[PDB]
Amino acid sequence: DNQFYSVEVGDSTFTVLKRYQNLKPIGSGAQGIVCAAYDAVLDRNVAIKKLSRPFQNQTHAKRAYRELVLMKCVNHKNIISLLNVFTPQKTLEEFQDVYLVMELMDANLCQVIQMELDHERMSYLLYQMLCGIKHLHSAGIIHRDLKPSNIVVKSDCTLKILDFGLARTASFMMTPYVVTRYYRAPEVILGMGYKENVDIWSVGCIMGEMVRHKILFPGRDYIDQWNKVIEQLGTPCPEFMKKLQPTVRNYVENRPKYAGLTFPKLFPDSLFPADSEHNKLKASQARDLLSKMLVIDPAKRISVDDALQHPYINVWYDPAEVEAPPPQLDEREHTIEEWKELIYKEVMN
Numbered sequence: 042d043n044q045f046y047s048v049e050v051g052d053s054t055f056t057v058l059k060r061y062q063n064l065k066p067i068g069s070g071a072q073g074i075v076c077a078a079y080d081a082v083l084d085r086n087v088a089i090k091k092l093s094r095p096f097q098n099q100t101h102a103k104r105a106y107r108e109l110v111l112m113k114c115v116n117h118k119n120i121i122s123l124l125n126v127f128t129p130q131k132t133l134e135e136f137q138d139v140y141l142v143m144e145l146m147d148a149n150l151c152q153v154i155q156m157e158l159d160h161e162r163m164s165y166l167l168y169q170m171l172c173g174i175k176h177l178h179s180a181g182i183i184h185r186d187l188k189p190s191n192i193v194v195k196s197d198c199t200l201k202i203l204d205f206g207l208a209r210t211a212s213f214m215m216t217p218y219v220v221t222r223y224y225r226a227p228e229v230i231l232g233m234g235y236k237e238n239v240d241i242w243s244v245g246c247i248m249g250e251m252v253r254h255k256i257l258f259p260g261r262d263y264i265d266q267w268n269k270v271i272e273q274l275g276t277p278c279p280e281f282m283k284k285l286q287p288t289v290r291n292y293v294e295n296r297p298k299y300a301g302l303t304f305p306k307l308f309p310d311s312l313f314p315a316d317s318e319h320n321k322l323k324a325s326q327a328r329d330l331l332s333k334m335l336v337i338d339p340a341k342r343i344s345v346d347d348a349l350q351h352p353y354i355n356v357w358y359d360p361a362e363v364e365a366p367p368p369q370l371d372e373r374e375h376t377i378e379e380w381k382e383l384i385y386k387e388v389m390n
């Protein structure tokens with residue numbers, strides 16, 4: 042009679058379509074709780090994300106609505122896809138929860154980062170990130186909050202990006218949960234405005250952490266984080282600071298100066314496989330790319346296209362893998378009730 046059933050998972054109550062069986066909790070991010078399950082209809086395992094009352098406030102609503110729309114229309118093998126979307130509630134008045142069904146992946150990038158990685162897999166994950174990023178930039182999407190906890194991978198080293206980044210407005214929250222800021226670009230830290238290669242900084246932070254196994258630029262707030270950045274990379278040039286607004290210019294130019302470590306000192310030979318000649322050269326190529334991704338001034342930072350052409354990365358290069366036909370706009374303020382309906386009717390395609 043009923044085409045849904047409910048079960049308790051960790052805390053939440055998952056009411057899902059009967060095709061999905063044997064639910065098990067596998068995570069809990071900010072926007073929801075996530076279960077693995079078996080899809081009897083597709084005969085495969087899937088991940089199911091539960092959004093509770095996404096329309097409950099502006100922040101949630103914008104994110105949920107955006108997530109749902111973009112993930113539906115954006116298609117690329119390094120961006121996570123929607124398999125199915127549903128709500129167990131029958132009417133707009135009763136509507137509460139949204140369920141996103143996605144491919145089931147094996148791990149976080151955070152998990153992978155902790156592992157000793159060879160050059161083949163390091164360059165391959167990085168290639169896949171750059172292709173994902175590339176696609177998003179083509180579709181008019183610039184992420185600005187790429188981070189290893191929002192990137193998932195499979196045992197076969199397949200990689201997918203989970204989310205579509207910052208809102209082109211941006212906020213407030215009540216839920217107690219800390220937002221991870223360490224992978225954000227200087228231009229996001231300092232409020233400069235940005236271009237596509239804002240996301241390259243993040244990839245540089247991930248790459249560098251894969252090597253060093255520590256977060257490059259930690260800190261309680263953007264104040265500490267900025268310090269960590271200038272300590273390691275040195276203070277930027279005045280051509281860069283001619284692009285800062287008056288108040289942040291003053292703040293930055295009045296921080297204690299630093300000369301900056303060279304990249305061999307930042308990522309020394311010790312941290313790389315360097316036993317064979319193959320590995321010796323790949324280490325050299327690795328550090329080169331790093332030095333071009335982790336530069337404070339975006340004017341001097343490498344682009345996505347030039348990163349994909351870099352020797353460390355272009356060994357994977359292929360035809361329909363770097364490009365495919367890419368495509369409406371929305372970014373405006375609404376009340377709860379208005380968001381509720383926008384999202385309900387996105388769910389009911």
Ligand SMILES: CC(C)NC(=O)N[C@H]1CC[C@H](Nc2ncc3ccc(=O)n(C(C)C)c3n2)CC1
Nearest residue numbers: 067068069075088143144145146147148149193
């Ligand atoms: C036990 C130890 C090795 N840790 C894990 O196994 N962790 C998780 C296992 C499940 C993984 N799979 C996965 N697949 C798809 C999604 C889709 C959206 C989403 O938000 N998540 C989060 C749980 C990361 C997904 N996780 C993620 C890491």
